[model samples]
Target: RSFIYEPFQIPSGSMMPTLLIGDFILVEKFAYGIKDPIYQKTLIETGHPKRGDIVVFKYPEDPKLDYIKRAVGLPGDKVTYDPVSKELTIQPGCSSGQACENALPVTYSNVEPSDFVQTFSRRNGGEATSGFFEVPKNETKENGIRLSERKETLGDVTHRILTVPIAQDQVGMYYQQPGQQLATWIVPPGQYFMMGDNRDNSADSRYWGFVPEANLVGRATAIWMSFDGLRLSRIGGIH
Candidate 1:
């Protein structure tokens, strides 16, 4: 009965705008081959992850739980991000002692007159957590909602993203573990890079590292239902 697709509930705003709390997303189990449910073993095969696809998988740190995020890098690619500039550079794989200038550019589009302005309300705790200012006592109880839109185009996929002036979050832009500097990572074969639509708020591959091939569960193909505590009228296919 549960052989082809799996349904998952969205519980966080990490994927806000694209997916919100109460979103019931459909993940095609066979998009990247099949897995036996009871045993979680590979059954039959075909399908590889492509960049820009939203995927659900067993969180590497806690395989018993499922986490969903966007695929940003494929194997052998070198991904680097600058939190200060909010820019990402994906250098295509190159061999030793060779020249490689194939870096995918990350650009944003906004209206001309506004000049990068961010507004807030008190409900969501000041819109963005830029690691900038703590909630000012002078702000309103309606101080939590923020509205800043910048269309980010990654390769051929263009999507709207929310952002603020802060380049680095309070937790820093990159992840580090003791002696390891992991901000710049070269995705090894059979690995994928992931990030969130709500860039600054998501704790994703940038913090944990690449997702392994075996951990992938499926590709998120549609938004069968959407709710932000209430219906959003956004019932449709995943773009």
Candidate 2:
């Protein structure tokens, strides 16, 4: 029998801010498009996911696991993460929104280049210093500070990301290979780079590999309901 899946509650905090530990998301199985008759019965395959869109997919490393994250890169897009710089770079037009051609031009100098920068790690219960670093060469006339924090506005979505010169030591240890671990990749046609809003805590593409298109289940719609010991304001749309 053909059926639609109902909204489900996410049990993890990997997608915090945008989605919480107990947030409820409405997932439509046929939103991006639809599923083929053969693969329709299984949740393994479906429509494609777009950048900035939050999606649920089977974990690539472990198919039995389910994960929900923000789709950041698309097919053939160059995805680069500089731990030293604390930045994630994706080729322009690779995302599903307005393309920013001048997003990664900046330079940092004078400051002692550490192996890693001090970042807030929840494990430490707060901000802590860690090693992992990179330095971006200045391309445009924008000064060093301009390169410090990159503000990117893609389509109707806008987010400020860190592009520091020092890479974090914890990065490479998490991903697979040392090369594939921290280097850029031309996202194979039909793969994606997904990350969570709580960058420091989420276990996402950075830890695993690319997300195959076949794993996409659906786009996360909204939070229609929420309750925290009598608190009701938590029930609303994702802002």
Candidate 3:
């Protein structure tokens, strides 16, 4: 039973808008295939993760922990990022007999003001130390930070994302794999590149590394419950 669906909770704003803090989500464990619960090795082959799937996997740096993020780069794809624009350019490697393209058709919608305000916590008189809070109605929050909300269409998946418009991405801190160019990564065979919708706040594949196919735990499919002091309306499917 647990192999079919497992439960997880959102503990941060890293997946805000699409998934909120306090969301109780249901992960479809069999989405990819059945795996050994203890060893985490695939017991059977089912299907591979698509580009836009929201996946839950064991953190590559520490398999003891589980992480959730969107699959951005599939196996064999070359992904590039723009630090200033915080955008991605994906070159999908040739599959089957298809010709390689200039770039994947990733597009963005116009930036719009969001109804939420994000807060940060400071330490030693510096900026946010860790974690964040999402305030609704654009209310003023302690050590608050504003955002530029937009729609990102990766392949056929259109999802909302939050970005810090004025903040420069910390490219220097990016996790570089051997033989890869700066701001670019080649998704290795049987692995995937993952990222969070809260682009500016997530500590994802960009900062750590790719998620091995063996680490895949499941795919996020729905929200069974939600609470920011009780938001029954949020109980529904997870896109």
The C-alpha TM-scores of every prediction are 0.75, 0.62, 0.86
lDDT of 2: 0.57
- Per-residue lDDT of model 2, residues 1-239, tens digit only: 33355587877655654555556768766333345576664333335666677788888988897788877767766667665654566674444333436443323333332222223344555444332222334332212221233333434455433334433437555565334435555566778878765455567777776888888777777786654343356566665
Question: Mind giving the per-residue lDDT tens digits that candidate 3 earns over 1-239?
Answer: 22478999998788867898899999887444455876677776545688888999999999998999999999988888898878888888843334456677899999886766665567667776354455575576667766778998887888888887667777889999787667888888999999999888789999998998889988898999998889899898875
lDDT per model vs. reference: 0.68, 0.57, 0.81
Deviation of model 2 at 11, angstroms = 1.5
Top candidate on lDDT is 3
Best by TM-score: 3
What CA root-mean-square deviation does each model show from the true structure? 6.8, 10.8, 5.0
TM-score, model 2 to reference: 0.62
The local lDDT score (0 to 100) that residue 214 gets in candidate 2 is 80
CA shift of 92, model 1, Å: 1.9
Model 3: which residue pairs collide?
A: none
